Ligand binder design. Structure first.
Ligand SMILES: CCOC(=O)CN1CCS(=O)(=O)CC1
Ligand SMILES: [Zn+2]
Ligand SMILES: [Zn+2]
Ligand SMILES: [Zn+2]
Length: 572
């Protein structure tokens, strides 16, 4: 218990006992904390509790130092000094924002705003506190037990009484009982196990509540600007394919860390892999939160980088399927592709962190703790989707508050901006450029004349809280009969329940906006489903319409976003 203060680093024996993370607080900061919050328990080698037998006084403001022990007002000896006096709490080696982070329930957007506008040490305290809160909230949910096994992909569940039921979607991953991780989609429910096991009745599922480790490293290391490219050796012979990013790869070698805002289809993966061709002797660790984002970088590296110097790090507890073409778990390879949670303790000449809007400050800090690099490159787009904040239910989380990297890209601007979209028909590029990019995203493709929009509110039904709009799926069914080229389209919507109904009626492959991020399809059929803050979110709208290479059909509920779509309007 000899540590450093989380607000001014002043060494102390004091730790707040009411805080879920028990931060070390100095004599002056422990006081401003206990005097302005319900948090009154103070800890050291021994807690600040009354030493008199059977006495339950633990409030530090009601306690005194009786020589070597602590006593309340009713038990203190004549020669006793209060623990709280002169703006200090008695201890060895003798903040409004710290109080709000220590006592908030993380259900409001203002909680996340603060966790990102506060000092660096408070961002790590905020990130452990939030993650610990999120993990103890997983215990609140009830146990699901297999009642009847219908087939190899359908079952019927029996839920625990008294405890709420967690939302049935791919967002929530259960642990079977240790028969492997499992997931469900909606009394006919679909069951998907990470490990193929002959489903037994009586075997139950519980959400994987993992221990929240403390954070040591900052979210962002302190910025360093250099006059020359440092520790990296460029090629003079640089492939014409990657010539557009040569000035940007040099900016990467002349700064400790750099930010790259890359709208959809502007060449983020190409920039990331081309940085390896530009610094060809440099050891690069490629990281992202999801296995899908690490795999998309693995796909781009298979096409340009030597496959024998590549390695895909897969955690021993292999959850879902991964990239198979690289030698697995060879930590020492020049190119290592790995998710943030599976990152080994290693060093690199460059660390590339992709899909930065999906990172949390907890993820940012983990990467700085496991990887010691000469250069760090953060690639993503703050106009794309952030990580789901399971506790947040009141207020909207704006892009400048997703993480430190996004906060920077939205305030001081990004260091590098990929300004030309090569994926989308110009109708889509023109819509999202005006919507989220201040008219600075340019269209490489021409207008495809295959981008359509329909204003159809339909009928909104609900499977618990996940929404369905059957008349919107019916309008799509009518459209498909008249436009059979759209047979190979991917169906996208903001709700998995709309996607389950569209899968059975249309037969199209189905994807939620959130799971479609970073993917591209020739044709996209999007039904807005509802007029909610979730379905009207401009970042989600931006991701939804930028998945299409050739054509898109948008069946809209919101007049604002429908009027903003620079598409050909249809009728029926
Ligand atoms: C030369 C400086 O360029 C930028 O900062 C790029 N900026 C364009 C408008 S945006 O897409 O809204 C935010 C990114
Ligand atoms: Zn302090
Ligand atoms: Zn506290
Ligand atoms: Zn007492």
């Amino acid at each position: 218990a000899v540590g450093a203060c989380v607000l001014c680093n002043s060494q102390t024996s004091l730790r707040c006992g009411a805080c879920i993370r028990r931060p070390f607080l100095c004599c002056k900061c422990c006081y401003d904390h206990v005097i302005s919050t319900s948090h009154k328990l103070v800890l050291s080698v021994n807690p600040y509790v009354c030493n008199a037998p059977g006495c339950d006084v633990t409030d530090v403001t009601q306690l005194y130092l009786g020589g070597m022990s602590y006593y309340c007002k009713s038990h203190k000896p004549p020669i006793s000094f209060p623990l709280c006096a002169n703006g200090q709490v008695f201890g060895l080696y003798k903040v409004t924002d710290f109080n709000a982070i220590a006592t908030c329930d993380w259900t409001n957007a203002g909680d996340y705003i603060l966790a990102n506008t506060c000092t660096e040490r408070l961002k790590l305290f905020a990130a452990e506190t939030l993650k610990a809160t999120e993990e103890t909230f997983k215990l609140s949910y009830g146990i699901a037990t297999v009642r009847e096994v219908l087939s190899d992909r359908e079952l019927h569940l029996s839920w625990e009484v008294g405890k709420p039921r967690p939302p049935l979607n791919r967002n929530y991953v259960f642990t079977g009982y240790q028969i492997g991780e499992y997931t469900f989609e909606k009394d006919a429910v679909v069951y998907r196990g990470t490990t193929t096991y002959k489903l037994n009745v009586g075997d139950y599922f519980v959400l994987t509540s993992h221990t929240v480790m403390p954070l040591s490293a900052p979210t962002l290391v302190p910025q360093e600007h250099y006059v020359r490219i440092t520790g990296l050796y460029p090629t003079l012979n640089i492939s014409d394919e990657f010539s557009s990013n040569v000035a940007n790869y040099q900016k990467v070698g002349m700064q400790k860390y750099s930010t790259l805002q890359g709208p959809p289809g502007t060449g983020k993966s190409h920039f990331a892999i081309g940085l390896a061709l530009y610094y060809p002797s440099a050891r690069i660790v490629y990281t992202a939160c999801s296995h899908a984002a690490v795999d998309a970088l693995c796909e781009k590296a298979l096409k340009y980088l030597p496959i024998d110097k590549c390695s895909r790090i897969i955690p021993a507890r292999a959850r879902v399927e991964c990239f198979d073409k690289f030698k697995v778990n060879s930590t020492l390879e020049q190119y290592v592709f790995c998710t943030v949670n599976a990152l080994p303790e290693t060093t690199a000449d460059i660390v590339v962190f992709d899909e930065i809007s999906m990172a949390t400050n907890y993820d940012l800090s983990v990467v700085n703790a496991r990887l010691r690099a000469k250069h760090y490159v953060y690639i993503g787009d703050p106009a794309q989707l952030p990580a789901p904040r399971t506790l947040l239910t009141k207020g909207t989380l704006e892009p400048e508050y997703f993480n430190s990297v996004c906060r920077l890209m939205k305030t001081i601007g990004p260091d590098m901006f990929l300004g030309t979209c090569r994926r989308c028909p110009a109708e889509i590029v023109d819509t999202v450029s005006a919507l989220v990019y201040d008219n600075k995203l340019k269209a490489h493709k021409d207008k495809s004349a295959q981008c359509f929009k329909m204003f159809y509110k339909g009928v909104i039904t609900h499977d618990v809280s996940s929404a369905i709009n059957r008349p919107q799926i019916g309008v799509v069914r009518e459209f498909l009969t008249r436009n059979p080229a759209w047979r190979k389209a991917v169906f996208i919507s903001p709700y998995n329940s709309q996607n389950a109904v569209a899968s059975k009626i249309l037969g199209l492959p189905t994807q939620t906006v959130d799971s479609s991020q970073g993917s591209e399809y020739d044709y996209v059929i999007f039904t807005q489903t509802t007029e909610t803050a979730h379905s009207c979110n401009v970042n989600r709208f931006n991701v939804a319409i930028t998945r299409a290479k050739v054509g898109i059909l948008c069946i809209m509920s919101d007049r604002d976003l429908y009027d903003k779509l620079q598409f050909t309007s249809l009728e029926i």
